[PDB]
C-alpha cells in the first residue's frame, strides 16, 4: 500500500495549496478570478480564515480540502466545504472521498450536525462522488436561491 | 419622520434575537427546524461565530440582520449573511434594506469583495426589496446545488 497521509493545514503549506488552486483555474473554467496570493493564504490560515486538510503522497501534495465555519440560527454553528480537489495523477485511488471523510470526522468529533457544500449541475464527477453518501439537495428540496453580490455592487450599495 | 436606531449584535442581545429567529423559522414554514436557544447562541456571539445588527425603536427589536465569514479559495475571506427579518408591525418602514446596508457597508470599510445571502424560491416578498440591488443569482444562472448533510448522516460517513 501507498501511503496517503492526511496532515491538517498550517500555513507553511499555503504554498502547496496556492499550487492547488491555480490548477482549479483551468477546470472549472473561470480562471482569471486569482487574487489569493500564497502570502495572503498564509495569514488566513493563521488568522483562521479557512481550515483544510492535505493529503501528501511521500514527499509530493496529491490533493487538498478547504472549509470554514459557518452559522445557522436554527442549529447552530455548521461546517462548509470550499475546496475538494486532487492533482489529476492521483484522482480515482479514493483520496477523492478520503479528504472528504475527515472533515466528517471532525464535524463528528465537534458535535456539528450539518455539513454543506455546493456544487455545479453539470459536474457529474462531484455529483458521482458525492452519490456515495446520504445527503439532501438542499436547492431542490427547500428551494433555496443563493444570491452572490460582488465587488462593484458591494460598495455602491454602502455609498449610497 | 419615525426612528430606528441600529447597534451592533452584543451577547447581551441574544435573548431578543432568539425571538426573531422563532418568528422567522415561523414565517419560513420551518417552525420543527429550530434547535437553537439564546443561551447557546449567547457562547456564540460571544465566540465571534456570528455578527449581527439590531434595530430597536425605542427599547422594542423589530428586526434584525446576522451574518458570518465564508472564505472563497478565490477571494479570501467575504460575508454571507444568513438571517435578515424584520418584525410584522416594523415592515414597509425601509429597515429591510437599511439592516441590510451595514453589511455592505462593513464588507466594504473592511475592504471585502463579495458578498453572499440565500432565500427561499416562493419568499418574492424578500426578492422584491433584493432586485433593488445588482445581485448575481448564482442557482439560476450557474445551476449551483448546495448539498445538505446533517447529522445523523454525518457519523454514518464517518463512522466507516
Do not use: C
Amino acid at each position: 500500500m501507498k501511503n496517503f497521509e492526511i496532515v491538517t493545514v498550517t500555513p507553511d503549506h499555503a504554498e502547496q495549496l496556492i499550487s492547488m488552486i491555480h490548477e482549479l483555474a483551468e477546470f472549472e473554467k473561470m480562471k482569471s478570478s486569482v487574487v489569493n496570493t500564497a502570502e495572503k493564504l498564509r495569514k488566513d490560515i493563521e488568522n483562521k480564515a479557512v481550515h483544510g486538510f492535505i493529503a501528501f503522497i511521500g514527499e509530493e501534495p496529491a490533493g487538498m480540502n478547504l472549509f470554514y465555519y459557518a452559522y445557522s440560527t436554527w442549529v447552530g454553528q455548521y461546517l462548509h466545504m470550499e475546496d475538494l480537489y486532487i492533482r489529476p495523477q492521483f484522482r480515482r485511488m479514493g483520496l477523492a472521498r478520503t479528504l472528504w471523510k475527515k472533515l466528517a470526522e471532525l464535524a463528528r468529533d465537534k458535535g456539528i450536525v450539518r455539513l454543506e457544500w455546493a456544487v455545479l449541475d453539470w459536474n457529474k464527477n462531484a455529483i458521482a462522488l458525492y452519490d456515495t453518501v446520504d445527503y439532501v439537495n438542499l436547492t431542490k428540496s427547500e428551494g433555496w436561491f443563493t444570491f452572490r453580490m460582488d465587488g462593484a455592487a458591494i460598495n455602491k450599495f454602502a455609498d449610497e
